[PDB]
Enzyme design. Structure first.
Site, PDB file in Angstrom:
ATOM      1  N   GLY A 278      -9.439 -11.233  -2.677  1.00  0.00           N
ATOM      2  CA  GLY A 278      -8.729 -10.021  -2.982  1.00  0.00           C
ATOM      3  C   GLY A 278      -9.601  -8.975  -3.648  1.00  0.00           C
TER       4      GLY A 278
ATOM      5  N   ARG B 112     -11.703  -1.962  -8.234  1.00  0.00           N
ATOM      6  CA  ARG B 112     -10.415  -2.131  -7.554  1.00  0.00           C
ATOM      7  C   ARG B 112     -10.523  -1.847  -6.051  1.00  0.00           C
ATOM      8  NH1 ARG B 112      -9.246   3.396  -7.507  1.00  0.00           N
ATOM      9  NH2 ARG B 112     -10.323   4.377  -9.272  1.00  0.00           N
ATOM     10  N   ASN B 113     -11.565  -1.115  -5.665  1.00  0.00           N
ATOM     11  CA  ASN B 113     -11.781  -0.799  -4.240  1.00  0.00           C
ATOM     12  C   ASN B 113     -12.871  -1.607  -3.557  1.00  0.00           C
ATOM     13  OD1 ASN B 113      -9.668   1.057  -4.320  1.00  0.00           O
ATOM     14  ND2 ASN B 113     -11.004   2.702  -5.105  1.00  0.00           N
TER      15      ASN B 113
ATOM     16  N   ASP C  60     -14.462   7.315  -4.557  1.00  0.00           N
ATOM     17  CA  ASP C  60     -13.513   6.421  -5.223  1.00  0.00           C
ATOM     18  C   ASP C  60     -14.125   5.014  -5.373  1.00  0.00           C
ATOM     19  OD1 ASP C  60     -11.004   5.849  -6.471  1.00  0.00           O
ATOM     20  OD2 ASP C  60      -9.937   5.609  -4.563  1.00  0.00           O
TER      21      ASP C  60
ATOM     22  N   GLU D 279     -11.013  -7.471   8.426  1.00  0.00           N
ATOM     23  CA  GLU D 279     -11.418  -8.846   8.117  1.00  0.00           C
ATOM     24  C   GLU D 279     -10.707  -9.308   6.842  1.00  0.00           C
ATOM     25  OE1 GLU D 279     -15.540  -9.440   6.582  1.00  0.00           O
ATOM     26  OE2 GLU D 279     -15.598  -7.253   6.477  1.00  0.00           O
ATOM     27  N   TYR D 280     -10.384 -10.597   6.807  1.00  0.00           N
ATOM     28  CA  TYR D 280      -9.653 -11.170   5.668  1.00  0.00           C
ATOM     29  C   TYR D 280     -10.611 -11.453   4.510  1.00  0.00           C
ATOM     30  CZ  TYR D 280      -6.721 -14.418   3.074  1.00  0.00           C
ATOM     31  OH  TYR D 280      -5.978 -15.031   2.080  1.00  0.00           O
ATOM     32  N   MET D 281     -10.187 -11.097   3.298  1.00  0.00           N
ATOM     33  CA  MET D 281     -11.002 -11.292   2.083  1.00  0.00           C
ATOM     34  C   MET D 281     -10.187 -12.138   1.123  1.00  0.00           C
ATOM     35  SD  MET D 281     -13.778  -9.579   2.834  1.00  0.00           S
ATOM     36  CE  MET D 281     -14.659  -9.152   1.324  1.00  0.00           C
TER      37      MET D 281
ATOM     38  N   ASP E  57     -11.322   0.877   0.937  1.00  0.00           N
ATOM     39  CA  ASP E  57     -10.560   2.046   0.537  1.00  0.00           C
ATOM     40  C   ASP E  57     -11.276   3.355   0.804  1.00  0.00           C
ATOM     41  OD1 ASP E  57      -8.880   3.993  -0.371  1.00  0.00           O
ATOM     42  OD2 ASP E  57      -8.146   2.839  -2.097  1.00  0.00           O
TER      43      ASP E  57
ATOM     44  N   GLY F  37       0.816  -1.192   0.000  1.00  0.00           N
ATOM     45  CA  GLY F  37       0.000   0.000   0.000  1.00  0.00           C
ATOM     46  C   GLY F  37       0.853   1.246   0.000  1.00  0.00           C
TER      47      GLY F  37
END
Ligand code: ANP
Ligand code: MG
Length: 277
Positions: A98, A143-144, A139, A93-95, A157, A23
């Site tokens: 992705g 992608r976000n 935004d 939290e895990y995604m 994001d 990032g």
């Protein structure tokens, strides 16, 4: 301050597995968090680079202070932060799957229309809550959005979010022309996201010159229907892209439209260079 809306985690409860991304402010990894109840969950961990600037720290944690205001199944969950030791961390939290745009690009034409509509409904539901809370994201782009092991899509994001950098391809004409950002400009962005999903992560307006993206959309041209796009969904895109922001649907209406399509899947069987709308 971040502590108004973020729990300070005990770093002993955090384990790091592997680096999964990079990032603006440091690395992103996956890992595990032990909750106070002793339950262990998978998480994403973002660290603030060593030798960070005061501004970098404020921006980094500021995005957490926005995220932590939302508690919704379709908005990325903030588990907490670590500020009392360094590296400073944000834990979410895990995604597993992705970012949504990259995920769809790996799977061109491989999902059912109902699967895609479920993804879109999730995103709309998160946006309905964000807009209910008085926030304009600014935004909103594939992608976000992050997507988990079960294909649940969640808004991410919060760097550009504001209470009521100019990604031109996703921004409404009024927001480009004079920085008129409203929940209706977020609806425009949502229309672009809808196009992105149905196109399996095609780039909006491809690599058209930015000045041409701005002029073409102003003249009334719109992105064309993705291949095999249901008529209902292309019409929804067109509605999100109404020139007059007051004519665009509200997020609540979008959610209702998608729920009807999920309830009557046969509806999706009617199938539909920029097109002049
Ligand atoms: N909660 C999460 N779960 C799993 N992976 C994540 C999570 N957050 C971020 N990542 C991964 O880390 C990557 C980069 O994180 P991201 O949130 O996109 O920050 P960024 O500053 O926008 N970096 P980039 O998108 O590469 O320019 C994503 O594309 C994901 O693959
Ligand atoms: Mg990103």
């Amino acid at each position: 301050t971040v502590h108004e809306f973020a729990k300070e985690l005990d770093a002993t409860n955090i384990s790091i597995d592997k680096v999964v991304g990079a990032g603006e402010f440091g690395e992103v990894c996956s890992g595990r968090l032990k909750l106070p109840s002793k339950k262990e969950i998978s998480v994403a961990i973002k660290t603030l680079k060593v030798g960070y600037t005061e501004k970098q720290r404020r921006d980094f944690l500021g995005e957490a202070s926005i995220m932590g205001q939302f508690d919704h199944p379709n908005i990325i969950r903030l588990e907490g932060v670590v500020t009392k030791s360094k590296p400073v961390m944000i834990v979410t939290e895990y995604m597993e799957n992705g970012s949504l745009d990259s995920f769809l690009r790996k799977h061109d034409a491989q999902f059912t229309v109902i699967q895609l509509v479920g993804m879109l409904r999730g995103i709309a539901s998160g946006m309905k809550y964000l807009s209910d809370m008085g926030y304009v994201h600014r935004d909103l782009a594939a992608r976000n959005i992050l997507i988990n092991s079960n294909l649940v899509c969640k808004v991410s994001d919060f760097g550009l979010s504001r209470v009521l950098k100019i990604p031109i391809r996703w921004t409404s004409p009024e927001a480009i022309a004079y920085r008129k950002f409203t929940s209706a400009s977020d609806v425009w962005s949502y229309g672009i996201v809808l196009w992105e999903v149905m196109s399996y992560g095609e780039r909006p307006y491809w690599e058209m010159s930015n000045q041409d993206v701005i002029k073409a959309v102003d003249e009334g041209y719109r992105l064309p229907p993705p291949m095999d796009c249901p008529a209902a969904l292309y019409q929804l895109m067109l509605d999100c892209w109404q020139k007059d922001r007051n004519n665009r649907p509200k997020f609540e209406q979008i959610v209702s439209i998608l729920d009807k399509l999920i309830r009557n899947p046969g509806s999706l069987k009617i199938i539909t260079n920029l097109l002049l709308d």
